[PDB]
Amino acid sequence: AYKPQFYPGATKIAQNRRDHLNPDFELEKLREIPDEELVKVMGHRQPGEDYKTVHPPLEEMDLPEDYVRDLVEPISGAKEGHRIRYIQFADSMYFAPAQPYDRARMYMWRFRGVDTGSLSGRQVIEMRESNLEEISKNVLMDTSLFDPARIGMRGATVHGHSLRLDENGLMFDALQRYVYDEKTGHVVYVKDQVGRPLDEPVDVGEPLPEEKLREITTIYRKDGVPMRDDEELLTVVKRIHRARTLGGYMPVNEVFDKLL
Amino acid sequence: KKLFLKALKEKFEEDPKEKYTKFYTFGGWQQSARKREFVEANEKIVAEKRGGIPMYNPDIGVPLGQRKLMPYKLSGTDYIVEGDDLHFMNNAAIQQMWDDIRRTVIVGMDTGHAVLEKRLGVEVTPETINEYMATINHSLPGGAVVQEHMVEVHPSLAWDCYAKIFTGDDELADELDKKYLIDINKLFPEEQAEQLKAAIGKKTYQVSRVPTLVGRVCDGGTIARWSAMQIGMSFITAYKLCAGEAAIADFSYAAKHADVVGVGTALPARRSRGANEPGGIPFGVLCDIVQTTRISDDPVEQSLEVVAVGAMLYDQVWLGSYMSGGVGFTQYATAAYTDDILDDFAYYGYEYVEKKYGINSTKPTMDVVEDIATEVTLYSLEQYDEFPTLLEDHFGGSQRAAVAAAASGISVCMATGNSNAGVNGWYLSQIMHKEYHSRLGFYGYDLQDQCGASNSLSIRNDEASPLELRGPNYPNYAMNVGHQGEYAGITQAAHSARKDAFAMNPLIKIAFADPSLVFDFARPRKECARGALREFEAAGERDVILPAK
Amino acid sequence: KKLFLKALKEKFEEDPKEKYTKFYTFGGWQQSARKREFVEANEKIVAEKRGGIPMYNPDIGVPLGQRKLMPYKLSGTDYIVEGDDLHFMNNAAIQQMWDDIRRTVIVGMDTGHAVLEKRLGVEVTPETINEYMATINHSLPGGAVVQEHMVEVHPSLAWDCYAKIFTGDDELADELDKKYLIDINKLFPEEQAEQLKAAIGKKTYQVSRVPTLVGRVCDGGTIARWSAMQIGMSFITAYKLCAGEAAIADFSYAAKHADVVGVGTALPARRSRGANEPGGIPFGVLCDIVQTTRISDDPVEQSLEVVAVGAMLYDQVWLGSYMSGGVGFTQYATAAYTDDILDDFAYYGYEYVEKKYGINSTKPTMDVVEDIATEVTLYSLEQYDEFPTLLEDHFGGSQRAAVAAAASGISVCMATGNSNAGVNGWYLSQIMHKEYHSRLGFYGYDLQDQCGASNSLSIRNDEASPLELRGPNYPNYAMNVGHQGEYAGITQAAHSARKDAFAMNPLIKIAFADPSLVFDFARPRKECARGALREFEAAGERDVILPAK
Amino acid sequence: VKYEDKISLYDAKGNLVEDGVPLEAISPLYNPTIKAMVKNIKRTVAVNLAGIENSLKTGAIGGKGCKVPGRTLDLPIVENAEAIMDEVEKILRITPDDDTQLRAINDGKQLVVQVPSKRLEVAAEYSVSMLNTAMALKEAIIKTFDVDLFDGSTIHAAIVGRYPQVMDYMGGNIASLLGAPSNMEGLGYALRNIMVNHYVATTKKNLMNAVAFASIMEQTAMFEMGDAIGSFERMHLLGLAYQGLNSDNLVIDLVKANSKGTVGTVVASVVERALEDKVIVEDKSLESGFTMYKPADVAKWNAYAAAGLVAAVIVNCGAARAAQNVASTILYYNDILEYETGLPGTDFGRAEGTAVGFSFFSHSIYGGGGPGIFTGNHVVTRHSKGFAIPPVCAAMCADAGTQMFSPEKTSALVGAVYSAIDEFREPLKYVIEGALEVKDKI
Amino acid sequence: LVVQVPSKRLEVAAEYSVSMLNTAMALKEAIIKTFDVDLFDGSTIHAAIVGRYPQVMDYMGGNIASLLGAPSNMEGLGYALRNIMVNHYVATTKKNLMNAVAFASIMEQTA
């Protein structure tokens, strides 16, 4: 039986990357954000309102027999024909506990029927609206994958991942969708991810301390763990590069035996 | 001692290494003198020209300026300009740089001179050539030479139009009128003059600089045709031939097909365009348009002036307008030619290579490529980690990826003198950067970089090519920002390491040394600054034919 | 009685029927105020910019003005101008006419509105559309709407840029903000408004008028792309969507391929060019760009204003520059829109047809085509015979052949309402003219005319097409002057005889009725005169970004 | 035989057909079914008789939004489909028993025209089928209704569109699976210019057959391009066999093992199977214990990675019943595979690269569109050498109706016409039959 | 060299560029194997054979040639057999008048 190894590297950053990919690694629960509060921050619909459909349920439709196609179990939202909605995060380069390609690889290892996009300033996940809500609540917001000060939910005007932090250690947001509450020491969402004002502000808890962030981050930084210190990871990157180069030149055993 | 420190202190008030700052204190767009000028200008044109139909409105979308809007320092200069002054639409120097490239065509004269002597029995001497040169300088800008009752182009509209001559034959060069000569021996240092003359032989060429106004009204495909028509007219007049006989067709075939050298080739399918358009210019030809090799002995400086021209042309004008449009790609390009950031990384790479391998002293191997690209990539990203203001400056991942990979690619070329080894180094820098910060560029930035390693040394029909012969029509490179201009710089680095006078076309190298050009191709970053500050005198305006203002 | 008599009286001192004149006593070029201005301009402003390199020299070739150099009267106007003022390079009105055509693209909005409602579940109302229209008028000229730290295009450089909306749905039209609406019911006479609305149905369209400066720096192929980028940006902002999600790609596919209508299609092989270039514009579309049909009920006047635009665009700009260059083809084109010559011949043909057959009352037959074309050709050539000053005016045979054949072709269309019957009449006029005077046009003038009769009614793959669907890329028509503009007039005559509101594309007809356009497409001969006299205010100048005069 | 490789042929239901079949039996250079598919794709034309009738009646000729007043003709073309069909056949036919074939479908509204293959034999390329069909139709209509000579050009415009002004069938009523040569993005690319939606509609949305049709045409194009030549040939043959034709039941086996799985669990199954079949070997363990792997057979590892890619698309796009997920699936299946093993991904990074540009151009303002409008010829999706387009076809078959530019919107005409040809509708079944026919002749 | 590609390769191809593309690939591999050319120099071999392809969609500056022009140069649909230079017909028939006439008429009428 093949035992997956997930990711190479001998530093704690590479171990944090392995833990995220590993479906058997239980992510630490840090907070309890109610379903109703999260739906409101997402800003696609109000809680209790019937899910909008893109197509009729699969059971109703009479599709021709296709053995291979029907071998795969569809997710609950696909069965009910629910529309496809999104959740987008900007992750601070200053030790945020989740990073763009780290997220996408983790999503593809742990979740079913995922459309995910990785960019320097934003990381998006497009999924059947109902399934997207359960995942966002139990994995993306309640666990150590989320830090209310250094990870921001934003669908437009994403600028901030590469910027200096503010006085309270909060990441920049041109629309100020979240604010620091001095009295409680908690981060509060005053707007939805697209910038619409909320009727009721949503408390997302207190920011994680710098010592905890440095321990669990998936980013290499000279002022944290430099990538220069992970010789093992550099060996695998260079190997993939060389294997790609030689295969492109001549995909034959003799070439790989002599030059790899 | 970092080359970018001066720019950071001019741009940021706080310590360049400080991680914390203050936001939402700048009054939005009102913080910028340029944005205030735009609002005031809008109010005027809406009432006077648009009949009350609104246009520019800073309140519709994003409230710009929640963060401090930063100015930019042109690398290697002391000019500090606002970002908006670097957009191609607002910068007459960038527009003239493209106009001067677009309106250039080179025509071999030896074929035409053979038709005259061997088919027509008419003698060709330096005196007849000098008479021909005076004729084409009247005909090319739109003056008439044969027919009665001809109308003509207003001279004030075509003052930038010239026909020049150059030759590899030193004996002929000495006899030609210096007013029309592009003097290879005077314009280039001795060693460079000898490499160019040996490459071109004893051949004679005409450079047609078609009026800027022509390319503006029409397109790039017009240029070789305009030049050919007037070359034909000038031969008929200067040599008293029948004004339309069998031998005239040979001159047209030579000037339009057999002896013509343009800047770019026609593009097919979705990119359907005529010759002399930016997408048709291969990377080796772009190197040869740039003239820093003639005035500086610094191989790094030579390569980075090519990166500047490449980013301005390929990203701002070509991808940002011809292939897209709107607000465009100013800052995707400025990251490669501002605040001395790429300069610092490329100079670090040069010194690392000079000490470890020496310059142009190593045959390319995978071990050599991997060593150099890794070291330069790690140094570059460590700079963004150490200086929070540097990361806030190159805020977009695509800008950071292009800068780190360009320095890596250039450094590999300094050691090997092979452009494909250099591009292979660029691709390793890209996949390493991705694992360093767990991000790279925009959504579709790394299509060519993931394809990269496999196609870099490929021998297959649509994958193979020396980097010099690749360009914006090379399949993997046809769509995305933050690559094309940097590839041109990597191409230059291979030739700068070898101390080559040219990269791919010596005719182009000689043609763009002409002192009669409007844009200064030897100092592009300086020229860009002059355009940004509205100090650049461009050609193509229509003042004389418009109502007084 | 003869419409050209007034012009001949203004142009020639002697009686128009006189046999003799005097030559070689005018002092050459010195007789003309325009030529004197050119010599003076060469000495002053030109010389200081060239560093002693000569340019304009009237003494090098042909001594112009051995005969009297004649001015020209714009047909149907009292404006008398010098010939040089009609060259496209020296005339800002001709340049703006082309700029306005080049920078236009039409995009269907119903598909995008369906993606919003059915895929995204976002409601579309007249209020949301009005909000969208304000957004695109900020975004299309180069203003930013989503990202922080964006640079922008100076509003003073893009005041001519507009995004407009039109609809066949009268209920929606009543609810849309009039500032952005192209009002079909107000701009067109009632009967024409009904024909257009019935043709387009209940569909809604947006017209993007990209800045003039964009097409000047770049090309025609840029226009549909620039429009698509900013349409996408405006939808994201106005409807608060994720700034880059799956559904956004549908808007791009619709705006670039599935629901886009440009002025011209891309050209292949030797003519390799992008969309929205003159060669890609079919004759039926050129008719629909011209707007005389909305302001005049005269079918002859409607057809001749199309001939004027056609000659100016196809002969002066397209064949004279894009496909050749230099001094060019001003007078090959002016013969079709000056001195009321073609007007006299076309009005004679109209009256002959009106009395004998009636207007649009005869099914085309070879007998009908042969009768009309013969009569109009004989009348036309008899005018050149009777008036020596008229022959001295249209001194080139090509000019005479195009004028006589255009009047013949137009007259056949007045009787039949069939554009191919009209073009067949043009070809008979050509071969008859050849036998009348034992000459026709220039060396290669009649390639398409000898091929003409056989391909006019052909059903073969590369020979067949209604004249509306033919254009400058139709194989026989791809090379020569004195045809394309006249063919557009023949196409218009078929629709003018039928009292049609449009010839081929009702979307183009509506788009060019926009009062916000710079050039007046309803009065082209008058606009040309205004440009000739330097009274026309053009867009695209760069004053604000250049050093103070 | 140039190679000693053997493959086991399995059908679309996962049933064994035959073990020990030579690899070259599925080659475009030897397989008789592949030869027939190219011959038929080149000579078959889809005719829209209802379209011609509508264009003539309304005067909607010359392309989108065009209408020419006074140039209308009211002809009952559909009602006279049989008479028109018989005249077209008479014009095209060379010998009484040749392969000229005409068929009326949807009650004479559309026509399946198969030009005799002799006409393609004496032609340089394939445009002849469209050009000859257009001419036969023009003559047949003119003769049937005694159309006036001044109206013949109108008939031409309703059939071919704005040709020759445009070097394409702009606004025409005739169609082919192949795009005009004027639209090729590279030399030898004609068989790559086939829309994803056309493959899906032609196979009636049957997943394994849409995958097979796309892999056959893409890999045949690789031979035409010169990519599947010399030392590169075996890579393309193994690619066709394993990714496109379910060889050794590899595609179906990986799907079955991951019925309730993820892209990550598919990667783990691929590595496990490659190790079992001795396609890859352990190289060395690094400091953390991470073990790098190496191919034991470079071209065969590439084919196994390619089969796993199709399985990953089936599992992930099937769980969502949405095609948009395909670009992200192709990208991250290859990205995860490389960092799980240190091995090169599908097509040495070119499948991952294609997926990057494909994701961007299927989620941005700059170009592209939905997954169904892409082709192997497209500027965005040409980069992988036959390994990216077959998975996109699988995703479109799993889509339950989330796309605007679906095959029902873009490919109704070509879909109905080409599905009438057996080798196009069920390619897997007929290519297997062809391999068994030639197996002992090579 | 006179290279006649097997007709089977044209039978399973859409058009005729396959002959030029397959010959170019066989030549590149044959030269690289014969002289053991270094992997960093392979792109140079490609450029000497096909020219500035794929930047230009033609064999610009190449050393391989056909009587037929590239399909990218066709001026109309179905024109490939018409894109043959007059001088090519003359040189191929060794300037024999009636044979040059016959060759040109055969190709033109087949087109």
Ligand code: F43
């Ligand atoms: C709507 C898109 C999706 C798309 O197809 N293009 C956009 C927008 C487009 C518009 C924005 C104009 C406007 O605001 O009205 C323009 C200027 C192109 C145009 N249409 O003229 C552009 N981007 Ni974008 N775009 C940029 C960039 C970026 C960076 C910004 C990262 C950050 O942290 O701020 C990210 C990609 C990434 O994450 O890597 C990005 C995405 C995006 N880019 C997201 C919007 C993100 C947002 O909501 O803020 N661009 C850059 O990384 C730098 C250059 C910058 C370009 C302008 C210039 O070059 O001056 C601009 C290039």
Ligand SMILES: C[C@@H](OP(=O)(O)O)[C@H](NC(=O)CCCCCCS)C(=O)O
């Ligand atoms: C892909 C293609 O678009 P289409 O899919 O054909 O609509 C192509 N555009 C581009 O490649 C846009 C390039 C410039 C903008 C993106 C820079 S990252 C073009 O318009 O021909």
Ligand SMILES: O=S(=O)(O)CCS
């Ligand atoms: O967000 S995207 O990567 O699609 C565009 C960057 S300009």
Ligand SMILES: O=S(=O)(O)CCS
């Ligand atoms: O003399 S020619 O007829 O060849 C050219 C006319 S402008």
Ligand SMILES: [K+]
């Ligand atoms: K232009």
Ligand SMILES: [Mg+2]
């Ligand atoms: Mg292990």
